[PDB]
């Protein structure tokens, strides 16, 4: 029933997926803040070239460097890495094929863009490879550079293929060093060092894709972490009252009595409008609970975040991190 089993505290790589528009970027950022509290250092990574981190923090596009982007509670630090697939490709050519010269020539004519676009699998090898490199990097003292890596990942319809290292490597040259590092990537992804969290809204499609993605990922034996239900809203009604209101029954005499008590008397048109207003609210809560019920099928931890009433700004990120913390995320 807990949202964050203790095992998720030993995870070093958190991947935040979910259907488009559910809040992967926001929640991956708040998660990074949550895990960074207490003088820890966490890296927040995005992989689609969408500069979503810079957009989230309302800053100019970030370069291909790990840079401090936020201070966490009690002296923690969140770094940002907007992975640049072109630079990552150049890095790859030079490190593993000593083809830096060719690579810099390709940058001139748009050829790196071409190669990454034409080969989907190479793209995923570079991205997942860079993620693994940030997860396992050690400092001068043989200690991990980062306490945790949080990835704003590709969405639920792509996450399974994105993490399909074997398929990615299938379309690369055989032999050489790439196949050596790919075994290490697969090991990381399948270990207790990794977890995939799925953000969803209480709407039909986000839940459907959450379920289907969980199924696909379990077949691959990839570790599921939490389902994170974003932008909840207040019911305001007790279950019995709610159920009645979703059918149109409101027992107004009681409502008229309560209003009378409150020093307010309403014209009949206004009273009818008020009665319609809470019935519609109850129909919405009931529809949401019906969709929600579909998640009860999974034996997966579930976390809940509120709706930030205005646009998500920096303070909102800290509010959401606090909610995660209060739910046991650590």
């Amino acid at each position: 029933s807990v949202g964050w089993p203790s095992r998720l505290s030993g995870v070093r790589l958190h991947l935040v997926t979910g259907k488009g528009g559910t809040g992967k970027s926001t929640i991956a950022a708040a998660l990074a803040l949550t895990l960074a509290a207490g003088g820890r250092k966490v890296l927040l990574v995005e992989v689609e070239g969408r500069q979503g981190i810079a957009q989230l923090f309302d800053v100019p596009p970030l370069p291909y460097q790990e840079l401090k982007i936020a201070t966490a509670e009690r002296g923690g630090q969140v770094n940002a890495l907007a992975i640049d697939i072109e630079a990552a490709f150049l890095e790859y050519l030079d490190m593993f094929y000593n083809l830096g010269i060719a690579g810099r020539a390709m940058r001139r004519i748009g050829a790196v863009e071409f190669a990454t676009t034409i080969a989907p699998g190479l793209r995923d090898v570079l991205l997942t490879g860079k993620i693994k490199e940030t997860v396992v990097r050690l400092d001068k003292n043989k200690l991990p550079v980062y306490d945790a890596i949080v990835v704003d990942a590709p969405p639920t319809g792509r996450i399974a293929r994105f993490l399909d290292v074997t398929k990615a490597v299938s379309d690369l040259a055989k032999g050489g060093p790439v196949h050596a590092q790919s075994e290490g990537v697969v090991k990381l992804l399948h270990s207790n060092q990794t977890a995939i969290h799925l953000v969803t809204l209480l709407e039909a499609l986000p839940v459907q894709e959450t379920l289907e993605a969980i199924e696909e990922l379990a077949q691959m034996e990839l570790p599921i972490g939490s389902v994170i239900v974003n932008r909840n809203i207040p019911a305001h009604l007790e279950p019995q009252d709610l159920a009645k209101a979703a059918e149109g029954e409101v027992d107004a005499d009681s409502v008229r009595a309560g209003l009378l008590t409150a020093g307010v008397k309403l014209p009949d048109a206004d009273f009818a409008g008020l009665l319609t207003e809470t019935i519609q609210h109850a129909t919405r809560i009931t529809a949401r609970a019906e969709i929600a019920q579909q998640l009860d099928a999974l034996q997966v931890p579930r976390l809940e975040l509120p709706t930030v009433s205005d646009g998500v700004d920096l303070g909102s990120l800290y509010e959401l991190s606090e909610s995660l913390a209060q739910q046991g995320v650590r």
Partner: protein, 355 residues
Amino acid sequence: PKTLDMGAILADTSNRVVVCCGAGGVGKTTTAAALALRAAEYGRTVVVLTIDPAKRLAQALGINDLGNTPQRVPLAPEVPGELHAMMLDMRRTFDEMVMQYSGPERAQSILDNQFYQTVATSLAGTQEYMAMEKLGQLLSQDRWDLIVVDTPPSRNALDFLDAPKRLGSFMDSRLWRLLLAITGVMGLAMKALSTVLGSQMLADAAAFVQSLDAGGFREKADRTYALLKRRGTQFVVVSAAEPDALREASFFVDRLSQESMPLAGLVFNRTHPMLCALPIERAIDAAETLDAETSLAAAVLRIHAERGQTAKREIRLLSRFTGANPTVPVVGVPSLPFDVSDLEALRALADQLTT
């Protein structure tokens, strides 16, 4: 403000194409369906090209199939018009385009190529490009006096107008023939690709370029895009109450203005009009007094104050958009208390849009 009058637009048969644009997730597909249905109820012979209809909506329309081609929607016999519907099949529209330009024989090779099947048909912008292609096919066969076009979802509403030309320019890159099917630089790039990419994959890719034998793709995208400038084209931009959807609507209206393309107006979807006139502050205070002292009366008060606050946000958002675009007609569509998954719910939605 200004009042968009979708009814008069739909009823006037000089309007032959109606394009629903906006961010994904704002109500484009259901709006497209409500508009196409209402146009049939006005007597028109309509086809709606939906891109991502909800399983249930597609069934109410009888297009839950794999066809890439319109089918009549059975409506009440009183209906003077005809509603037909289809769901874009991106991959199959790609197949049809390939055959249309390479011919059926060469097409068996292209369609059999694993690089075509696994990479080429899922490149970015395929969905917009094939939506535009399918629209082209619909126009050329002259099988309808009205085409209502749903447009694929994207965080970026301008993708519908920009991604197809972009994809065409990518397809026509010199790098296809030079790098897959010599020079110091191109020779470097070719060596790099040969050393990094799998032999099977490079063979399939060079096969694909050879077979297709195409600036073909950009020229197709340009010709098809000009169709959106024929007389009789109307764009309807759909946006929800959210700031993001509204901002995409504004971007899109701006582009439509710069290109002198006809914008019917904005559908401002999922509003929460107030049914009761009790002021917010009163609502809160009254509930708090009851809080100090039957829970039901206080809760109803909190429902109403919450809704009131939401309505305030919505009103100020629209006021922003109307301030920037005082020339753009608007219709506000309230959030309806049921899902839009049946012809009857489509009818209630169309009632909201047309009036």
